[PDB]
Design a protein around this nucleic acid. Structure first.
Ligand SMILES: [Cl-]
Length: 123
RNA sequence: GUACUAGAUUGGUCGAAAGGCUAAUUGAUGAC
């Protein structure tokens, strides 16, 4: 297939599943921010530990600023295929084009793993 | 304009009301 230009690397299915799992566990035991306004602010404030970006966002410009900003702030980001499922994982009733984990809670080791894998995918 | 926010509308139903329940539509692409 072909990906939107804001998608900078290919994410294996098991790694996207881990991202959604991390969002759900952080929702349950830590702190997240959901929606692109809240997500971008958390990145600008240095609060985000991981940013999760859906791959089916149209128009792209809603999230296109996130990867360059995350790279500047040196905050890891990861992609999932469905904004609908990302909103569900974030505990809301509609889609979420992006989410930020602020406090991973019990997702701490999962976020570290994703971060380590993304660093290799970034090369 | 900035920050915050996860509700909102209509119909049905229950209720003495406040409103609860419920369905459809709608809201993190940020509704009210
Ligand atoms: Cl009503």
């Amino acid at each position: 297939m072909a990906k939107p230009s804001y998608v900078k690397f290919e994410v294996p299915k098991e790694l996207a599943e881990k991202a959604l799992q991390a969002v759900e566990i952080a929702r349950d035991t830590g702190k997240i921010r959901k929606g692109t306004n809240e997500t971008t602010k958390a990145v600008e404030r240095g609060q985000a530990k991981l940013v999760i970006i859906a791959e089916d966002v149209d128009p792209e410009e809603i999230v296109a600023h996130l990867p360059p900003l995350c790279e500047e702030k040196e905050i890891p980001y990861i992609y999932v295929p469905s904004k609908k499922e990302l909103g569900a994982a974030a505990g809301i009733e509609v889609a979420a084009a992006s989410v930020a984990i602020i406090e991973p809670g019990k997702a701490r080791d999962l976020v570290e793993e994703i971060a380590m894998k993304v660093k290799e995918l970034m090369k």
